[PDB]
Structures are given as structure tokens and as C-alpha cells.
Design a protein around this ligand. Structure first.
Ligand SMILES: O=P(O)(O)OC[C@@]1(O)O[C@H](CS(=O)(=O)O)[C@@H](O)[C@@H]1O
Lengths: 296, 300
């Protein structure tokens, strides 16, 4: 399966501290780790670990951070070839402080050097992939990549989360729009997930889904309400479950056109990742997955 | 020509400019970011060099890109890095800094465990060759060695007594001048009332003790007497390394003048002028620009 992931890549700089700052002054971290993130980036890593030809299309700087981010993606088996590296530019990143009790302070810097312009996408031949997954954190890239992919007759999958911008026009370009409870609520202005999914369906000729963590995943199939329960597992690290689900769902939808099979498969990949520690290091492969899924 | 040594830490500061300092947990958004070299002893050295002293920086760095960037910046400012130890396959230290609209800063330092605390290397160096040795409290074993050597040689010792996890009692005792921060002095004494604290601190050393209280200025004890130098009210632009620059200027002034009152005024001025001029280490004035700014106030 050939997969493209369009969206954002951010370097998390994690500082483990005795207590979260709270007041001003100098503090000393007991420990430090540098892990890449971003919805479309983690989704790509998931799809690669499941053994797809996976490409990540996003924006980085010509700085050390840019190099660190794209090198990690490659090391995970994600091709960075069509990612735009901007000259004399800083990449997006976050400083994160983490308490003993698991409480987090996040300072995100979205780099203004990485321009929202998405005319760069026209240089890419989109026919070369079976599915294009996009996140809603780079609206102009999502819209271009989906238009190109539709012109080429390629499958489109959206990670429809909470964003300030209206994603009505994006849901319409989506063959599969997989929302989050908040994402779906913002779009429809309806807080009852059932009614919302029905409202959302009217916006697209494609399929609509809402993920509710432990409550599992709901979706509409020809006006019929369908559901896949969440897998009861001993959760250890929930860092990127939603991103990993979208990655697996794209691969599964491309391989097995079956919605029900695809959603079960994704729910499993996500669940297995939550058991294994190390965030991106916890993501299973088509073998570790098939095995976990056999525990039925 | 004052010959100055600065012993301690050199780190890459990762500066995040935010709307407000984080008080509680959750997500925040930086308006802007810069990666600038820092560290107390390193910035103190840069300040002393800009004031026109033969300045040496003695600390520990990695063999990584960051290490090279840090030592190159120090040299570019005219600080000799000749006695700094490069560890041959190691990452250098770093800090994340959040900076509010008003210039107030939260600094979260990560000391690289690759830079080992061993300081016995210092014994090979001839401490006689300097007029004053300034140390910060972040490299405990280097501070203690450098001050013992400098004392054996009869060289002046100046301490930047800031917040560190370890107890700096033994360091204050080796200090001819111990210039604390409100938090640093509180951690040392476990007394939050600065007057009583300074009195407790004095008992630890045959030297002089001072506490810096930002806008409330600098207090110090001279033969049991409370002495004070007010902070200079200036149009503040950049708060970068103000405290570090103060210690740098204070060391140079104490070596040149031997006058406490004059020295502390002079340092408070270097720091104040730096707060007006932007570019952090590019904002630090010289003995001339400073003397000029200090004279101009009686006229405003
Ligand atoms: O807050 P000030 O007094 O200006 O000192 C700041 C500084 O010198 O110290 C930090 C490390 S730690 O605090 O010593 O661990 C460095 O990142 C920074 O350059």
C-alpha cells in the first residue's frame, strides 16, 4: 500500500521536573528527552510500522531541529523526500515540563518561517499513492492535497479534530472524515454525538466517524448507525493513540475496503500502542497487531 | 589591565517569548523564540571582556555542535576558552527559558550528565596569573577547587550565590565576596527575611556578603552596618543575563577600586545600561559608556 500523510511535524523537548514551575525563577530538570510529534507525522510512522510505502509531506526549517525531525521520520521508515525545507528558517517545536504526578506545562512555538502557502504541492504527482491522510493543523495543505488526490482519483482520509478554522469545505473533499468528539461538536454545534454524525454526513458524499476514546468509535453506513467497541487493555502511555488510529485506518481502508474490518483493525493498533511504553516506540507492526487481534 | 577568570557553566539558552509566565498546567503559545548562549560564569566573563579585562572562562562542554557554538561565541566576545574542558563524545548542557512581556523569566536548566563533576584538572593551571576568580554555584566541585587554589595563591574570590540543589556553605567560606540572589540566600539559610539572612550568611565567611533584590537594589554588610545601592530606573527592553552581567562588573570593579560602595553602584549601572540596549550580550556597555551613563543621572 502506498500512503502519503500531509500536515505538521513538531519536535517535543520534554523536561522531567520535581514540581511544575508555577512561580518565576530558576529550576533544574531531573531528566530530558527529545521526541518528534504531530498528527500527520505520527500517523505516517504508524503506517510505516504496518509496512506501507509511507511519505510525509509537511514544512521544516534549515535549522538543527529540522534535521533532527526529518532524520527521526526516516529512521522510522517514513520517506521525507517531498517535505519542504525552508532556507534561513526555524522549525516548529515545544518545551514541555512533566511533574512526578504526570501533570504537563506545554510551551508550543509554531514557526512563522513555515508559510501556510500550499502551491508547493503542485510539484508532487499524487497518482503515485493509494491513500492521502491529512490533519487539520495546516488547513491550506489539507485543502490542496485533497483537491489534487481527488483529481487523481486517490482515497482521502481526514483527522477531523478541534481547529479554530471551519473544516466544512475539508469534510466535503474527504472520502472518509474521522472526527474527535470536540472536532465534531465544533463543526456541527451539536453536543449529542449521534445527532452530530447525522448532521456531518450531509456535508460529504464520503463516510463520517467519531472516536470517543473508551466508548470506542461510531460511524454512519447508508443512514445506519454502526459502532466498534474499544479493546479493554492495561493502558500505560496514551501518547499518540488518536494519530496512530488515523494511520492504521488509512492503511486498512486502502487494503480492505471494509469499513467495519478497517475500524476494528485501527482500534487494535491504537490499543496495542497504549500497552507498550515509549509513545512512538510502542507502535506495533502487521505481525504484533495480527497477534494482539487474535486475543479476540 | 585586570586579569579575570570565570569558573562555572556554559549552556545553550532556548528562549521562548510568551504572553504571560505559566502559573498552572495546560498549553501556551510563544510569540517568538531564539537560541542564544548563556550560563552565569559565561555571561559574567562576556561582561568583564566588554569592560576591557583579560578574561578566561574555565568550564565543561561536549564535542557536539552545541559545545562548538558555545565556545565559538565566548571567543568572538574576546573571552579566552583555552582552559575549558571539551568531553570527547558528550552533549553540552541547556535551558528552556520562558520570558513574559514585562521581562520576567522562568529558567529550566538541564545539566548534561556527560559532563562529569571531577575538577582535579584545575590543579595543572597557574591561578597566580589572575587578579580575581569569579565562580557560579552550578559546578560545585570546580567552584570549590578554583577558590582553594586562588586562596593558596592569595587571589580575590567572587561568588554568584544563586539557587542550586546542593548546599553552597563550603563555597561561601572560600569567598572574599559572596553576592547572593534572594532565592539563593533563602535556600542557604532557610530564612526568607533578607535582613536576618544576610546576618546568618556573614557568620559563614571572613569575606563580605551581598543580596540582590532586582528593583529593590542590592544590600550588603560592612562592619555590622547595613549598606544599600538602589537599582537604576531605566526603560527596560531586554532582561537577558542582567544578574550574570552584574556579577561580572562587580568582580572587575572590586579588583580595580577595592571600594565596595563604588563597585556595587558601577555594577548596577552596567546591568541597567544592558537592560536598555537590546541583543543580550550585544547590549553590554564598556567602562567608558558606563562611567558616562552613571554621570548623566544627577542631570535628569
Ligand atoms: O537568571 P539569571 O540570574 O540571569 O541567570 C541565568 C543563567 O545564567 O543561568 C541559567 C542556568 S542555571 O540557572 O544556572 O541553572 C542559564 O540558562 C542562564 O544563562
Amino acid at each position: 500500500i502506498r500512503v502519503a500523510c500531509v500536515g505538521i511535524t513538531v519536535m517535543d523537548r520534554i523536561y522531567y521536573v520535581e514540581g511544575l514551575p508555577t512561580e518565576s525563577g530558576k529550576y533544574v530538570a531531573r531528566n530530558y528527552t527529545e521526541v518528534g510529534g504531530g498528527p500527520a507525522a505520527t500517523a505516517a510512522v504508524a503506517a510505516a510500522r504496518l509496512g506501507a510505502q509511507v511519505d510525509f509531506i509537511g514544512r521544516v526549517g534549515d535549522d538543527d531541529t529540522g534535521n533532527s525531525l526529518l532524520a527521526e521520520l526516516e529512521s522510522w521508515g517514513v520517506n521525507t523526500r517531498y517535505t519542504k525545507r525552508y532556507n534561513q528558517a526555524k522549525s516548529s517545536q515545544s518545551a514541555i515540563m512533566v511533574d512526578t504526578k504526570g501533570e504537563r506545562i506545554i510551551i508550543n512555538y509554531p514557526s512563522p518561517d513555515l508559510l501556510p502557502d500550499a502551491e508547493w504541492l503542485e510539484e508532487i504527482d499524487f497518482s503515485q499513492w493509494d491513500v492521502v491522510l491529512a490533519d487539520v493543523r495546516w488547513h491550506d495543505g489539507a485543502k490542496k492535497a485533497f483537491t489534487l488526490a481527488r483529481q487523481a482519483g486517490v482515497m482521502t482520509v481526514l483527522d477531523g479534530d478541534i481547529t479554530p478554522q471551519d473544516i466544512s469545505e475539508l469534510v466535503a473533499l474527504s472520502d472518509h472524515a474521522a472526527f474527535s468528539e470536540p472536532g465534531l461538536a465544533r463543526l456541527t454545534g451539536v453536543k449529542e454525538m449521534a445527532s452530530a454524525l447525522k448532521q456531518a454526513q450531509t456535508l460529504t458524499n464520503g463516510h463520517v466517524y467519531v472516536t470517543q476514546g473508551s466508548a470506542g468509535c461510531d460511524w454512519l453506513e447508508n443512514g445506519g448507525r454502526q459502532h466498534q467497541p474499544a479493546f479493554k487493555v492495561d493502558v500505560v502511555d496514551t501518547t499518540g493513540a488518536g494519530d496512530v488510529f488515523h494511520g492504521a485506518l488509512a492503511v486498512a481502508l486502502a487494503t480492505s475496503g471494509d469499513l467495519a474490518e478497517s475500524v476494528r483493525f485501527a482500534s487494535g493498533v491504537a490499543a496495542l500502542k497504549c500497552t507498550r511504553p515509549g509513545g512512538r516506540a510502542g507502535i506495533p507492526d502487521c505481525d504484533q497487531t495480527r497477534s494482539f487481534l487474535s486475543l479476540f
